[PDB]
Paper text:
The motor protein myosin-15 is necessary for the development and maintenance of mechanosensory stereocilia, and mutations in myosin-15 cause hereditary deafness. [name] (encoded by the [name] gene in mouse and [name] in humans) is a plus-end directed molecular motor essential for stereocilia development and maintenance. Here, we present cryo–electron microscopy structures of myosin-15 bound to F-[name], providing a framework for interpreting the impacts of deafness mutations on motor activity and [name] nucleation. We propose myosin-15 enhances polymerization by bridging [name] protomers, regulating nucleation efficiency by modulating [name]’s structural plasticity in a myosin nucleotide state–dependent manner.
Here, we report the cryo–electron microscopy (cryo-EM) structure of the rigor wild-type myosin-15 motor domain bound to ADP F-[name] at 2.84-Å resolution, providing a framework for broadly interpreting deafness mutations in the motor domain and at the [name]-myosin interface. The sub–3-Å resolution of our rigor wild-type structure facilitated building an accurate atomic model of the myosin-15 motor domain, which has not, to our knowledge, previously been structurally visualized in the absence or presence of F-[name]. Myosin-15’s HLH motif (I1641-P1671) mediates the major contact with F-[name] through its engagement with two longitudinally adjacent [name] subunits (which we here refer to as subunits “i” and “i + 2”) along a protofilament. The first helix of the HLH includes myosin-15 residue D1647, the site of the p.D1647G mutation in the jordan allele, which forms hydrogen bonds with S350 and T351 on subdomain 1 of subunit i. In the loop portion of the HLH, a pair of hydrophobic residues (F1651 and P1652) inserts into a hydrophobic pocket formed by subdomains 1 and 3 of [name] subunit i and the D-loop of subunit i + 2, where L349 of subunit i closely engages with myosin-15 F1651. In contrast to the CM loops of myosin-1, myosin-2, and β-cardiac myosin, which primarily engage in hydrophobic interactions with F-[name], myosin-15’s CM loop-F-[name] hydrophobic interface is minimal and is instead dominated by a network of electrostatic interactions. Myosin-15 has a relatively short loop 3 that nevertheless mediates substantial contacts with subdomain 1 of subunit i + 2. Nevertheless, we observe a global compression of the filament along the longitudinal axis, which is centered around [name] rearrangements at the myosin-15–HLH interface. Rigor wild-type myosin-15 engagement elicits rearrangements at the [name]-myosin interface that are propagated through the [name] structure; however, the D-loop continues to adopt two conformations. Therefore, we conclude that rigor-state myosin-15 binding maintains flexibility in [name]’s D-loop but shifts the distribution toward the In conformation.
Numbering used by the authors:
A (entry chain A), C (entry chain B), D (entry chain C): 3 to 375
B (entry chain D): 1205 to 1734, 1749 to 1813, 1818 to 1889
The structure:
């Protein structure tokens, strides 16, 4: 009867899991699987062949860390099963065979990904029901709006979804394979100019922490670079795990600049502002005014200081001066997809949109293409 | 005359049938029943005629035929087997505490003393007076019983052609971890509370004792008083028994000094002081250490070093290595446990020497052993208990299969080799040397950074594919072992803390050089007798192996005492309680081993309407049985045919019943 | 069934033998073989051609003492057999053909040494099983840790082995051929400045006793030398076997100083502190903090007074001030390798790691390379 | 007027210097500086405090040899000045104050290295002009191609640079800190298995000579090891300077194997073949076919026998079977960087790309960041 649904926002970098109706995810941990890369010499020490989540980062210095998801696509289907098993049993401490599960996926992913998630849910974990949602719709659900264009940016992909009065325009949906992971790689590359070498996968986590703590978005790039070159007031220090101290200057704002200039990492694509403007201009002329004032930002990559100010400046430069530009960046936008999924999964009217086990048995794994979206 | 005595003669033996027959016997005030040669006794909580000389002469010898079941039948059967085979025999009285094993042992002792010697009864008087001392030193209050024996009493009555010589008492499978650790709503052994309650005041002032709530070794349970027990009266009775048993005032004073020393040693704490390269435990207050030293007549500095230091001693040097807080705690607990064990051994040795025998040619052994234990919260002690019970159930199943083979051979049939799956896999799962659970526990007790979680992970890794072993779904600190009595879940919470029982040579040397004679004698004897057993589990396994090795030179006889109701109501019975007791006592293992016997006349007279309309053959025999057999198109390999009995009924019974109801469906 | 294993820690200078499960070695004696060098004139006196162990030091004044092991490598394979026979029969009073044997070896020795030990054990003494362990792992076993870097120093070699959570990093293993024997030789050399001449091998033992009794490590070398030169309060006397009394001053702390300045004996290598720091810096950045606080010292050469204080001072000078430096020097570190071997050989799970006689018969002496380490 | 430019290819291990327009370097000598480590007893003998180049290897047995460059980064700025002074005056016999100088550097070095080289050239040696080039571009210049991916491997670093029609893709540039020096260290480590001990810096040169003369690359590792173990036909002898003869077997091909399996020396990086394939796959899909057939190998570490065959085999295994794989390994690839620099510095159109002294005076040492690359 009272079977609480499970909301699992398995992103490329973080797993956000919890119960429907809650205000925050119950379990948040990195989506990594680690394996030992050294020689075990003590008897009985070395009987574990895999580490998932936070225990993979506690043992970070002897493991090889691998991500099962790149750019929103699950490429390793055994590590993904390990991560899902960890989430269901060790983290949520719940039995999946008695809870409906709600999962999320990027708008323009291959269909085999969704079919394989459906098969794994219905055959390995024996869930009673299933649904796969689109992350931007859940961002709107969490934002308390029915009209707006969502710029979601995790660390796999960046996509734009314009929605008006609950109606989506699929032809105006954008997608970029440029997100937090590429920012971490670019910061790792440009940290070599000061003589800092981060090579292994365990140092990728240190570089990611540096990026989260120190990096920010400059309102204007050229004068910021001139100020950084003409003085030393923009430099900050960071302490490495072994006690060494590093210092970074213009690398603080040069790393997030690749979101607006993808040419830094050798991509021909346009910036996030131009992508958003292009997505808006692909909609009806009667929809554009409402979309201009409902720019909803979601994801962890949108958490840089000053990113909303620059997005508003760029859109104002692009859009006509008559329109009013608003960038909605709630302080909890890092969990907006999960919050929206929790809101949606707790609705009583939503109970008729689940993919039940009987429907799967009847129609194969392809039922998810007509039941979802 | 509706009930039956021996259920072996029954044609269909099922759990429901056994329960129905047992409750029918109990409702007629018939306590004792027979399973082949295995007796079953239900405690009635009421005085019954289980005594009287007329019963003795009625059961004297083989003149009765064992038509009525009684313990005297077990006694005279053991006597007859001894006189036939010229070999010793043992009688194993198992069962839960309060199920009636104690008075069963006393009645057996009285019957043997009455029928063997019948001229002198001094042996039974001398061995009965030692019972209160053992009961006070070996029982404790648990969450299931208010007086439970935590050890196995081994009484050996020596006989020389009907002449009762001296008796030897031995103890086995004593719980070492209860001396220093007790769970919620349970106490330590009764002796400490009796000593603290009934001691004379000036003795308490001399020993600086206080109320039981202050001591750490006793207050862990939180309920130091039993509602319905008088400690002072029992303590005075124990004094009377010691005075009868020749224990002088000096010996009693020494025993009280040892117990007070254990109690005071239980109240020593340590602090984490900072050293140049480690954390070192130091005693908080030296009052307790000095009190223990004064009570035991040993050096105070020697005791403090034996508690807070580790000695690496080769020929050319002797190095002192400071211990941690946990290591010091383990050392103190090990000292307390070894002191208690040595004291109990000394008491039993003195009691045996008081009634020492002369020759050793024949002997009757009586074992009063505790049975299966399945509580709500389940831990290491019950794991050892269930391991011992599994090793006893091995012999029980061996005896049952021997009786089954004897039944098969006695009937005029070509005796085949009957399949039988013993409980060896469970014993291997628990205590096999390569990767047994207890072996993993012993390995983790010396590994550098081992805790309970690592031990659980090792157990899960090594035994994940065992059918008997089962893991919890959620990451709970527990595991499940499928015993003969069902699935039992063990909570791994202090398995490593309860297993550390290592006492080093420095402590033994300190205790040998004492100013009192009894303690020095005990520790000198222990050092002379002492071994790679440094843990509680290893010593328990060694003691159990000794007990088993004492028990293959004879054919055991089993007495299974049950319990009809937990409220001790004399007459009230429950079916679920009977099922639980039958599962725990191993009686249903006989039913499991059986899988099926029917007389040839019964089914001929019953199922005659399945093939023909009414086939009333006047001449019965094996030929008509075979005719009715292959007229039904049934393979001969799934059943067997003899004279009348041993007609195997694996699956033919179900199909025969189905055909009978199908035939009777029309009319 | 209950076949107790034998632990034999045959070092360059001392043999440490005993039974698994004990708290101390049963037999400890020098690893020397002596032969007469004079003329026997009494009939019947002089029928013994070799003396092994303590009996070689009782007759020290008529014998030529030779060591079968230099720098952890067995160079004399008949004297080694004599020593092993002595250990098994005259010292332990046990029959080797019914006891598994555990032996130790330096981390970076030639493979022929290990193969020859295996062949001698399996063909001359007919042991039922065998294992060869690494001494630093046994030091960690005795120390009750799974993470730490071990500085073992006997009198043949000095090596560093960093281990984290039971995983060894073989690329960070160091080795120095500078140990107690070199210290004895250097003390013998610098004792000639006061006119004391020790030449023969029998006087090497006297110099070794002097070094063990009087030598210590100075916290700082230069001010210690200044104090020793400006006064005479650091001088101590020693009595020779024939009654002569010698006095030594700055030689007390100049001898152990070659551990931190190998240039005194003409070596280009770095001190033990710099070697330990270099070994730490070759590990992962996430391992260094735990290693800095788990510096385990083992062996007889680490028994000098004040050596741990100077090691901590030097590592603190080298390592960043943020990290916390701990030097673990247990009072029984002279027997830590044997204690760890005894702990390891008594484990029930270790019974599957022995090299059985059948495996040797099948695979030749080369089985030890894949079965051990 | 006719001021001939100087090309100085100062690598981590060798200095390759000469005049622009020549076909071969004029001066080639090791990049080492030696200092005495013993006691001078003869009057007048011991007045030299430093030895640079070949004279540092003639006196190898009394000196401490140090390299001013590790992994392509100059760490000692006084020894580097000594080496440059030696090159300009004692080797080339030319006055640097009247010749433009062309220098080389690894693609992803710290900027301070380049700025310091510029400052030293313009302030200490007073050169009239300067340029800093990338070694892979010079390798392509020497190879006579404009399209191709270059695998340069000296003894400091290994890097990949894909270039198409004279256009470089900086985002696909790889770098490994695994090269000849690490191979020498690994060979020194694995030579201890046969009992050969090389400790000092002077024996590092002997080990390097052994590696150059005897080591080779096996086409397949496992069957080569099986053949070496099953026979003794792969063993070769080497004569040490004092007459001792050493013999090595599988160490001949186990040393260069760490280029394809960096895990032997405890690195998590991928082999050179996988690094090259990854660099190719980071380029445009229309560039990959031309790059697959223009794999240019340069440097001294690429001089092992059979390295090109194994590189082709590995790339063929990785790349699709449709493509055609070509490995270009010219016999003079040890000097390809210098040859390309000589070709580039002699061009008449290149005279406008020099960094003149006036530009340096105007713009400080930071002019090199915008004038070069
Ligand atoms: N405060 C922050 N500043 C900058 N980047 C951040 C911050 N917090 C998270 N990130 C980046 O966002 C990415 C994770 O965001 P998330 O939305 O959880 O990704 P996904 O949904 O794909 O798992 C990581 O790469 C992380 O480095
Ligand atoms: N107290 C001490 N002070 C200084 N040196 C010592 C001391 N004890 C032993 N040694 C030295 O340590 C060496 C022996 O240590 P040990 O660890 O037994 O060597 P190995 O393991 O190689 O046999 C000898 O050279 C001895 O002189
Ligand atoms: N024939 C050869 N075989 C193997 N290795 C070689 C050979 N020739 C040179 N090397 C190695 O290549 C390295 C020097 O190459 P080079 O390209 O001059 O380095 P760099 O450019 O960094 O100075 C040295 O480590 C040397 O041992
Ligand atoms: Mg997301
Ligand atoms: Mg040693
Ligand atoms: Mg080069």
């Amino acid at each position: 009867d009272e079977t609480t649904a499970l909301v699992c926002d398995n992103g490329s970098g973080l797993v956000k899991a919890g119960f429907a109706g809650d205000d925050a995810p119950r379990a948040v941990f990195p989506s990594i699987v680690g394996r030992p890369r050294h020689q075990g010499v003590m008897v009985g020490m070395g009987q574990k062949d895999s580490y998932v989540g936070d225990e993979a980062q506690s043992k970070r210095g002897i493991l090889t860390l691998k991500y099962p998801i790149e750019h929103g696509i699950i490429t390793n289907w055994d590590d993904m099963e390990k991560i899902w098993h960890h989430t269901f049993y060790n983290e949520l401490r719940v039995a999946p065979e008695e809870h409906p599960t709600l999962l999320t996926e990027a708008p323009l992913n291959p269909k085999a990904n969704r079919e394989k998630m459906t098969q794994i849910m219905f055959e390995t974990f024996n869930v009673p029901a299933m649904y796969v949602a689109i992350q931007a719709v859940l961002s709107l659900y969490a934002s308390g709006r029915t009209t707006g264009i969502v710029l979601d940016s995790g660390d796999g992909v960046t996509h734009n979804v314009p929605i008006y009065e609950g109606y989506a325009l699929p032809h105006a949906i954008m997608r970029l394979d440029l997100a937090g992971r590429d920012l971490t790689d670019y910061l790792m590359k440009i940290l070599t100019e000061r003589g800092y070498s981060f090579v292994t996968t365990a140092e990728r986590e240190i570089v990611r922490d540096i990026k989260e703590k120190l990096c920010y978005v400059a309102l204007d790039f050229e004068n910021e670079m001139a100020t950084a070159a003409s003085s030393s007031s923009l430099e900050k220090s960071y302490e490495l795990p072994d006690g060494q101290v590093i210092t970074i200057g213009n690398e603080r704002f040069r790393c997030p600049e690749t979101l607006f200039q993808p040419s830094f990492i050798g991509m021909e694509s346009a910036g996030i502002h131009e992508t958003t403007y292009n997505s808006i201009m692909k909609c009806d002329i009667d929809i554009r005014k409402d979309l201009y004032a409902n720019n909803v930002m979601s994801g962890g990559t949108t958490m840089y200081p000053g990113i909303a100010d620059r997005m508003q400046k760029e859109i104002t430069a692009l859009a006509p001066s008559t329109m009013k530009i608003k960038i909605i960046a709630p302080p909890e936008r890092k969990y907006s997809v999960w919050i929206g999924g929790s809101i949606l999964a707790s609705l009583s009217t939503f109970q008729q949109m689940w993919i039940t086990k009987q429907e799967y048995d009847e129609a194969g794994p392809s039922i998810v293409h007509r039941k979802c979206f | 005359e509706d009930g039956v005595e021996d259920m072996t003669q029954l044609e269909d033996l099922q759990e429901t049938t056994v329960l129905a027959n047992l409750k029918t016997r109990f409702e007629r005030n018939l306590i004792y029943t027979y399973i082949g040669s295995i007796l079953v006794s239900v405690n009635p909580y009421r005085m019954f005629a289980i005594y009287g000389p007329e019963q003795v002469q009625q059961y004297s010898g083989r003149a009765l035929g064992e038509n009525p079941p009684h313990l005297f039948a077990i006694a005279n059967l053991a006597f007859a087997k001894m006189l036939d085979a010229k070999q010793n025999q043992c009688v194993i009285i198992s069962g839960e505490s309060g199920s009636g094993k104690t008075e069963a042992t006393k009645l057996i002792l009285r019957c043997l003393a009455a029928m063997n010697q019948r001229r002198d009864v001094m042996q039974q008087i001398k061995i009965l007076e030692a019972t209160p001392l053992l009961e006070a030193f070996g029982n404790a209050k648990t969450v299931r019983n208010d007086n439970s024996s935590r050890f196995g009493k081994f009484v050996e009555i020596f006989l020389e052609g009907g002449v009762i010589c001296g008796a030897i008492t031995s103890q086995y499978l004593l719980e070492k971890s209860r001396i220093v650790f007790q769970a919620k709503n349970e106490r330590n052994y009764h002796i400490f509370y009796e000593l603290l309650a009934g001691l004379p005041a000036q003795l308490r002032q001399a020993f600086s004792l206080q109320e039981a709530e202050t001591y750490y070794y006793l207050n862990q349970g939180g309920n130091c008083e039993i509602a319905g027990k008088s400690d002072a009266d029992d303590f005075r009775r124990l004094l009377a028994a010691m005075e009868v048993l020749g224990f002088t005032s000096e010996d009693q004073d020494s025993i009280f000094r040892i117990l007070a020393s254990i109690l005071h040693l239980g109240n020593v704490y340590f602090e984490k002081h900072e050293t140049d390269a480690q954390e070192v435990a130091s005693v908080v207050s030296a009052r307790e250490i000095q009190a223990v030293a004064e009570l035991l007549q040993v050096s105070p500095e020697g005791l403090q070093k034996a508690i807070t230091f580790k000695v690496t001693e080769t020929i050319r040097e002797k190095i002192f290595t400071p211990l941690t807080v946990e290591s010091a705690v383990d050392a103190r607990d090990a000292i307390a446990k070894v002191l208690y064990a040595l004291l109990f051994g000394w008491l039993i040795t003195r009691v045996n020497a008081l009634v020492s025998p002369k020759q050793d040619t024949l002997s009757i052994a009586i074992l009063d052993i505790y049975g299966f234990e399945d509580l709500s919260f389940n831990s290491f002690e019950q794991l050892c208990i269930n391991y011992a019970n599994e090793n006893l159930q091995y012999l029980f199943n061996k005896i049952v299969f021997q009786e089954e083979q004897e039944e098969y051979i006695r009937e005029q049939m070509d005796w085949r080799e009957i399949a039988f799956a013993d409980n060896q896999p469970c014993i291997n799962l628990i205590s096999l040397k390569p990767y047994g659970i207890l072996r993993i526990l012993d390995d983790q007790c010396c590994f550098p950074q081992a805790t309970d979680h690592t031990f659980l992970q090792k157990c899960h890794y090594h035994h994940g594919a065992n059918p008997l072993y089962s893991k919890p779904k959620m990451p709970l600190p527990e595991f499940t072992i499928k015993h003969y009595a069902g699935k039992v879940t063990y909570q791994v919470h202090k398995f490593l803390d309860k297993n550390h029982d290592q006492v080093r040579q420095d402590v033994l040397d300190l205790f040998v050089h004492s100013r009192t004679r009894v303690v020095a004698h005990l520790f000198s004897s222990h050092a002379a007798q002492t071994y790679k057993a440094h843990t509680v589990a290893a010593k328990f396994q060694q003691s159990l192996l000794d007990l088993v090795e004492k028990m293959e030179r004879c054919n055991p006889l089993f007495v299974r005492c049950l319990k009809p109701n937990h409220k001790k109501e004399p007459g009230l019975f429950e079916p679920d309680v009977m099922m639980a007791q039958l599962r725990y006592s191993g009686v249903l293992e006989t039913v499991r081993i059986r899988k099926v016997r029917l007389p040839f006349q019964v089914f001929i007279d019953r199922y005659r309407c399945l093939v023909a309309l009414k086939l009333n053959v006047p001449a019965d025999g094996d030929m008509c049985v075979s005719l009715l057999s292959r007229l039904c198109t049934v393979t001969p390999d799934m059943y067997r045919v003899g004279i009348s009995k041993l007609f195997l009924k694996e699956h033919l019974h179900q199909l025969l019943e189905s055909m009978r109801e199908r035939v009777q469906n029309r009319a």
